[PDB]
Amino acid sequence: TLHALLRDIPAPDAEAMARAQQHIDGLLKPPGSLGRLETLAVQLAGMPGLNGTPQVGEKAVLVMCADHGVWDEGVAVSPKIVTAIQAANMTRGTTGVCVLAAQAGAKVHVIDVGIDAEPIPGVVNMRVARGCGNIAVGPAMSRLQAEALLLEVSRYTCDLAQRGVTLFGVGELGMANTTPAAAMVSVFTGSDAKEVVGIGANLPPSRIDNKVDVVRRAIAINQPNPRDGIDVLSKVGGFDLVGMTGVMLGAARCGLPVLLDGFLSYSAALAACQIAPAVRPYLIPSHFSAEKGARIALAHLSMEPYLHMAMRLGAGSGAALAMPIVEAACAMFHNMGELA
């Protein structure tokens, strides 16, 4: 059950962490001089699915794909079918995340959680419905649909471990998805909509006030409770955002690391950590998204990304680009010599 999953996420292993820190401090360098590589190695050492040491085996980027009813509000410049076209392109290896994942030695798992099109052969089918409800007039979904998809995606994630995967990355695809993301950041952080609504996929600036108004309307109509992250997801999120939260919950349940992507992912991470604070030690930032609301979301997660790429592609591309940073931390730990 989902209550049992949340309950059973392990604490980080303090003993393992202390053993890793003592190891690091004895390496061939001034103490502390590898900076956040050192801290990342210790962070990884405490994740129980890594068996007491910083290591990377297989890598998986899980790309959650869905359509959104709020597309009808005029908040996205791209036509709705682009979600389906780009999900199919993911199965061919031609998208940004595909190419970056291949550089990293990672596999991309393309997951349809609610595309408004016929199912695409080759994509993993977890579809809740053909797009979620339009958040400007009512909820994205029912509470039950959100909890079922959390549990499904969490189980899928953990099951990859059972297959060799030690490091996850999250991403999404869905036209209009930066609207619900902004809604959820506004709810969880207490920030006004204006502070967290961006251009998404090159929305013209002339259309920004409409998008702010839509966010505020979604919130006012649905009255999401910020102390119930499931409620927030269900009311003002989307199936893609639920899916990403699910990957985070499942990785945490398996005691394994998950790399965030950009702003969409930060909104899902705010939900995951409200739902289960025990998720937080498993999350690793990648990059600092170019979306307006990035800073605020990151501040609330107490996260400082490694990469400043002015990226806003999504779909997991940042996560993939950071996987060699994680591998680097593990290589430093295992392969450096010792001062003594």
Ligand X SMILES: O=C(O)c1cccnc1
* 151 assigned binding-site residue: no
Identify what 186 binds: a copy of itself, ligand RBZ, ligand X, none; CB under 5 to 8 Å per kind.
none
198-203 long-range contacts, CB within 8 A, separation 24+: 198/263, 198/291, 198/292, 198/293, 198/312, 199/291, 199/292, 199/312, 200/75, 200/76, 200/176, 200/291, 200/312, 201/76, 201/77, 201/78, 201/175, 202/77, 203/75, 203/76, 203/77
* 202 assigned binding-site residue: no
**Among 241, 239, 298, 288, which residue's Cα sits nearest to residue 261?**
288
Return the half-sphere exposure (C-beta side, CA atoms, 13 A cut-off) of residue 200: 26
φ, ψ of residue 307 in degrees (nearest 5): -110, 130
Buried b or exposed e, range 135-153, using 16+ CB within 10 angstroms: bbeebbbeeebbbbbbbbb
Residue among 201, 208, 307, 325 that touches ligand RBZ (CB under 6 A): 201
Identify what 240 binds: ligand X, a copy of itself, ligand RBZ, none; CB under 5 to 8 Å per kind.
none
* 141 assigned binding-site residue: no
Identify what 151 binds: ligand RBZ, a copy of itself, ligand X, none; CB under 5 to 8 Å per kind.
none
Residue among 12, 26, 29, 210 that touches ligand RBZ (CB under 6 A): 29
CA 208, distance to chain mean position in Å, is 25
Q: How many residues bind ligand X (CB under 6 A)?
A: 11
Counting contacts by CB under 6 A, is residue 39 touching ligand RBZ? no
* 76 assigned binding-site residue: no
**Among 126, 143, 132, which residue's Cα sits nearest to residue 229?**
143
Residue among 43, 83, 95, 265 that touches a copy of itself (CB under 8 A): 95
Nearer to ligand X, 158 or 196 (CB): 196
Site for ligand RBZ in 61-100 (CB under 6 A): 76, 78, 82, 86
Query: What does the block give as tokens for 179?
Result: 């609207």
Nearer to a copy of itself, 3 or 308 (CB): 308
Nearer to ligand RBZ, 137 or 336 (CB): 336
Counting contacts by CB under 8 A, is residue 96 touching a copy of itself? yes
DSSP letters, 4-66, are: HHHHTPPPP-HHHHHHHHHHHHTBSS-TTTTTHHHHHHHHHHT-GGGTTS----EEEEEEEEE
Q: Where along the sequence are the contacts to a copy of itself (CB under 8 A)?
A: 27-37, 78, 86, 89, 92-96, 99-100, 102-103, 201-202, 290, 304-314, 317, 321, 324-325, 327-328, 331-332, 335-337
Task: List, as residue ranges, the binding site for nicotinate beta-D-ribonucleotide.
Answer: 172-178, 201, 263, 289, 312-313
Q: Where along the sequence are the contacts to ligand RBZ (CB under 6 A)?
A: 29-30, 76, 78, 82, 86, 172-179, 200-201, 203, 313-315
Q: Where along the sequence are the contacts to ligand X (CB under 6 A)?
A: 178, 200-201, 261-264, 289, 291, 312, 314
